[PDB]
Write a protein that binds this DNA or RNA. Structure first.
Ligand SMILES: [Mg+2]
Ligand SMILES: [Mg+2]
Ligand SMILES: [Mg+2]
Ligand SMILES: [Mg+2]
Ligand SMILES: [Mg+2]
Ligand SMILES: [Mg+2]
Ligand SMILES: [Mg+2]
Ligand SMILES: [Mg+2]
Ligand SMILES: [Mg+2]
Ligand SMILES: [Mg+2]
Ligand SMILES: [Mg+2]
Ligand SMILES: [Mg+2]
Ligand SMILES: [Mg+2]
Ligand SMILES: [Mg+2]
Ligand SMILES: [Mg+2]
Ligand SMILES: [Mg+2]
Ligand SMILES: [Mg+2]
Ligand SMILES: [Mg+2]
Ligand SMILES: [Mg+2]
Ligand SMILES: [Mg+2]
Ligand SMILES: [Mg+2]
Ligand SMILES: [Mg+2]
Ligand SMILES: [Mg+2]
Ligand SMILES: [Mg+2]
Ligand SMILES: [Mg+2]
Ligand SMILES: [Mg+2]
Ligand SMILES: [Mg+2]
Ligand SMILES: [Mg+2]
Ligand SMILES: [Mg+2]
Ligand SMILES: [Mg+2]
Ligand SMILES: [Mg+2]
Ligand SMILES: [Mg+2]
Ligand SMILES: [Mg+2]
Ligand SMILES: [Mg+2]
Ligand SMILES: [Mg+2]
Ligand SMILES: [Mg+2]
Ligand SMILES: [Mg+2]
Ligand SMILES: [Mg+2]
Ligand SMILES: [Mg+2]
Ligand SMILES: [Mg+2]
Ligand SMILES: [Mg+2]
Ligand SMILES: [Mg+2]
Ligand SMILES: [Mg+2]
Ligand SMILES: [Mg+2]
Ligand SMILES: [Mg+2]
Ligand SMILES: [Mg+2]
Ligand SMILES: [Mg+2]
Ligand SMILES: [Mg+2]
Ligand SMILES: [Mg+2]
Ligand SMILES: [Mg+2]
Ligand SMILES: [Mg+2]
Ligand SMILES: [Mg+2]
Ligand SMILES: [Mg+2]
Ligand SMILES: [Mg+2]
Ligand SMILES: [Mg+2]
Ligand SMILES: [Mg+2]
Ligand SMILES: [Mg+2]
Ligand SMILES: [Mg+2]
Lengths: 100, 146, 124, 47, 114
RNA sequence: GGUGAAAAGUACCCCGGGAGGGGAGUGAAAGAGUACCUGAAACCGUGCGCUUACAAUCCGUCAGAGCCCUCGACGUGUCGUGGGGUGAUGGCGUGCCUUUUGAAGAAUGAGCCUGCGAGUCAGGGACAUGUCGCGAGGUUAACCCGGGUGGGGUAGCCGC
RNA sequence: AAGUCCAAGAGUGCGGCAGUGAGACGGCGGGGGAUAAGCUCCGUGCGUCGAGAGGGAAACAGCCCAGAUCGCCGGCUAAG
RNA sequence: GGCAGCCAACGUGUUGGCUGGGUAGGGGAGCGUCCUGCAUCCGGUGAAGCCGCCGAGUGAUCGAGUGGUGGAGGGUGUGG
């Protein structure tokens, strides 16, 4: 029992009881959110028609908000003296799916 | 995270292909595809995922055009002025297997993983082979229609 | 007031070498040789951070083409039929399914051929 | 309740002194003179 | 952990790698074989190393009261030390320098039951 | 230039001809023993984990199996919004600064480290830019009196 | 006369600040050259590099497509 | 999804529209070191320097965050 979920303009294959790292969305941690469906697989049969995809919904629980590993940006160009530094760190959220 | 092959999740199989009256380019391209393993959905470029392929009757290769006399296979031994010249006709007259071996090694990757894929190609001239113990599955090259 | 130079240079040089830990030869031991190829390494990181999406998409399509040819259909025909059917699933999920559920691909290729038109060479 | 602690200059009364030729981040390798020339070495007479 | 004793001789007038040549022949051997090898290896560095091994064996036998037949060399190593600095005249009156090298020697002995 | 609080500068025993060392004692410490506070980097090893002897390379990055160690839930190892060290194997990949239209350039400089090394300074000098007080007025120098930066000082200065 | 008119950050004047006055390539109109040079000298509200990251032509500044605020193991495309 | 500049409306800083490649060069805002002023504080129950681990900032970085050496001085803040 696994399904494909749309979030933040991204797609992910998630099964029941799994925790996924998706882009930050405005929601209080500990609450529940509803997401649309791109594909559901249940054993022998699958549902791919867009009508059933819109009909079915996926509910997940926002667990925490997290910042990713530090990534540092260096634009350096030879023989010209151009030397640039920049760091970056993205906020990410973890969701624990409950029911599909 | 995407899928990648594990240590022992890799699987091998044995295929035997007859080369009687088969076009050299098509046969060698299909063989190269099979050795790289683009036929399995578990392909991954940094690890070998293909199958062992055995070709029979290397002397029965058929090629189009007048290249039987106007195509040359080149190599140089190492000394200056040591360049030597032989044709495909002479090559099949002397060592029939060399033409198919060269054709396949030319399209496999020319890195060490490529020559590691090259390790698993068996090429013989005669109609028999001592690898009947591994029950290879005969393979006939086909084209998908669309 | 004379400010003699003890810690100022040392902090930055140590952070450079510490970030440059893990190289070979003079590379991980020597400063003047660290900063140069430290910057080269991070420039490579910048470039291949973009290159990684392309490489992954390449591998992804390769796996999908493999699965399609196993199911007796070409990649271009499969994608065109999928677009005609209006399925918005992406190559990530198709590749994971190809690794995972040939039943899922069997259903998907059936849908694609069903959505495929009568003649592919029609002027329409 | 103002102590010697509570003394601040006027906003914008303090402008930072420019350190020229103090690193390629801001001003490097040329010190605001550009490339080669007599202006890059000393000067030119006004007249 | 096992009982062990250490002994070293610094400021010895031999080159570091030149003493290390001999030292590489004694690592991990028993003390008897060590003494035999140092006696029978024709090198100048064989003398200081054999003296250090003999002294370490004496220290282990005396201070800690260990039986010499069971002692083995645990780790032995030579490190370069302060280098005496000299000058040598060479051709055309132009002068080059001579680096008079000096080495440290360290020996620690471990008693391993058979 | 720096032992230490003071020479209390290591009695005595042992290996060694001595140099040198190990204990025992001094001392808070001898990882403070006179080559003596703190002791880094270039430098020279030892021991441990991993890799490498079909392998063509500005030596790294992006993937990435395996091996070793570690942290929790679950038993003999298996996952988990895991880290750590190594990395076999594939994609990409032509050091840095100068001076140049043009450099990986087979153009210049650097063997390496530790420090030293470059728009600073004076004038009732001048201009323009922010800031502060008075205002048709704005103001002082030299100099006099207060162990003190304060008070006096209309000679001049700049627009009206 | 209209169009961007929560701005191109458009024009003109004045004031404070330095750089530049060694260009190169390609397409156009040309001179010299032998319609030779990767040649030289011009013109270009020409473009590019200089002062530009990416993909394509094997590599290759100047040709072709296209303007790198940062990140994503997402989709549609230009040249090819 | 996030940071940053310009602009418009309203407010006692939210919303909305654009822009953000850049050498010489111009403008704006900052980090760190030494030395002084003061309100004060830390430190033999271990300061500075030394060598790591974990974190956090868009940057020069920071941690009154801790581990092993060291045994005697330093710090916040606003200023110069
Ligand atoms: Mg250049
Ligand atoms: Mg510069
Ligand atoms: Mg490595
Ligand atoms: Mg010039
Ligand atoms: Mg210059
Ligand atoms: Mg000039
Ligand atoms: Mg002898
Ligand atoms: Mg005591
Ligand atoms: Mg010393
Ligand atoms: Mg000392
Ligand atoms: Mg190794
Ligand atoms: Mg091997
Ligand atoms: Mg090659
Ligand atoms: Mg390389
Ligand atoms: Mg590479
Ligand atoms: Mg390459
Ligand atoms: Mg420089
Ligand atoms: Mg030149
Ligand atoms: Mg140039
Ligand atoms: Mg030139
Ligand atoms: Mg060379
Ligand atoms: Mg030259
Ligand atoms: Mg030269
Ligand atoms: Mg050069
Ligand atoms: Mg020159
Ligand atoms: Mg040189
Ligand atoms: Mg020299
Ligand atoms: Mg002046
Ligand atoms: Mg003024
Ligand atoms: Mg006065
Ligand atoms: Mg605007
Ligand atoms: Mg002007
Ligand atoms: Mg100027
Ligand atoms: Mg000129
Ligand atoms: Mg000119
Ligand atoms: Mg010109
Ligand atoms: Mg020209
Ligand atoms: Mg020209
Ligand atoms: Mg022309
Ligand atoms: Mg003409
Ligand atoms: Mg010329
Ligand atoms: Mg032109
Ligand atoms: Mg230039
Ligand atoms: Mg370009
Ligand atoms: Mg441009
Ligand atoms: Mg390119
Ligand atoms: Mg942009
Ligand atoms: Mg706004
Ligand atoms: Mg910018
Ligand atoms: Mg500049
Ligand atoms: Mg204390
Ligand atoms: Mg303590
Ligand atoms: Mg502390
Ligand atoms: Mg101390
Ligand atoms: Mg201090
Ligand atoms: Mg501070
Ligand atoms: Mg202050
Ligand atoms: Mg200040």
């Amino acid at each position: 029992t696994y399904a494909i979920v749309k979030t933040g303009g991204k797609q992910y294959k998630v099964a029941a009881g799994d925790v996924v790292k998706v882009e930050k969305l405005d929601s209080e941690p500990g609450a529940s959110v509803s997401l649309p469906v791109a594909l559901v697989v249940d054993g022998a049969n699958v549902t791919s028609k867009a009508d059933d995809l819109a009909k079915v919904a996926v509910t997940a629980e926002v667990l925490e908000h997290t910042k990713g590993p530090k990534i540092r940006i260096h634009k350096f160009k030879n023989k010209t003296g151009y030397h640039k530094r920049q760091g970056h760190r993205q906020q990410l959220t973890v969701l624990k799916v409950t029911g599909i | 995270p995407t899928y990648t092959p594990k240590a022992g999740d890799t699987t091998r199989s044995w295929y035997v292909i007859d080369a009687s009256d088969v076009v050299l380019g098509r046969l060698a391209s299909a063989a190269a595809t099979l050795l790289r393993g683009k036929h399995k959905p578990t392909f991954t470029p940094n690890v070998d995922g293909g199958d062992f392929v055995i070709v029979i009757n290397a002397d029965k290769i058929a090629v189009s055009g007048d290249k039987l006399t106007k195509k040359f296979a080149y190599r140089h031994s190492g000394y200056p002025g040591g360049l030597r010249k032989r044709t495909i006709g002479e090559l099949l007259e002397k060592h029939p297997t060399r033409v198919v071996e060269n054709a396949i090694i030319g399209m496999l990757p020319h890195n060490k993983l490529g020559r590691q894929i090259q390790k698993k190609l068996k090429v013989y001239a005669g109609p028999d082979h001592p690898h009947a113990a591994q029950q290879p599955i005969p393979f006939e090259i086909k084209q998908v229609a669309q | 007031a004379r400010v003699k130079r003890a810690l100022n240079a040392q902090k930055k040089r140590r952070t450079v070498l510490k970030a440059s830990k893990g190289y070979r030869g003079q590379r991980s031991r020597l400063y003047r040789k660290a900063k140069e190829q430290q910057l080269h390494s991070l420039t490579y990181a910048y470039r291949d951070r973009r290159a990684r999406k392309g490489e992954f998409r390449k591998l992804w399509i390769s796996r999908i083409n493999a699965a399609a040819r196993a199911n007796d259909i070409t990649y271009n025909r499969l994608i065109q039929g999928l677009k005609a059917a209006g399925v918005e699933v992406d190559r990530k999920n198709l590749a994971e399914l190809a690794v995972s559920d040939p039943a899922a691909f069997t259903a998907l290729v059936d849908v694609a051929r069903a959505a495929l038109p009568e003649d592919v060479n029609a002027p329409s | 309740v103002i102590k010697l602690h509570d003394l601040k200059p006027a906003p914008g009364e303090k402008k930072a002194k420019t350190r020229v030729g103090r690193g390629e981040g801001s001003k490097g390798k040329t010190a605001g003179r550009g490339t080669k020339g007599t202006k890059a070495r000393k000067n030119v007479p006004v007249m | 952990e096992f009982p062990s004793a250490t002994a070293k001789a610094r400021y010895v007038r031999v080159s570091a790698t030149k003493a290390r040549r001999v030292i590489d022949l004694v690592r991990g051997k028993s003390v008897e074989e060590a003494l035999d090898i140092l006696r029978w290896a024709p090198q100048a560095a064989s003398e200081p190393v054999a003296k250090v091994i003999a002294s370490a064996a004496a220290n282990a036998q005396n201070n800690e009261g260990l039986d010499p037949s069971t002692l083995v060399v645990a780790t032995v190593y030579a490190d370069e030390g302060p280098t005496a600095k000299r000058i040598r005249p060479r051709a055309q009156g132009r002068a080059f320098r001579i680096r008079k090298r000096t080495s440290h020697i360290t020996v620690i002995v471990e008693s391993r039951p058979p």
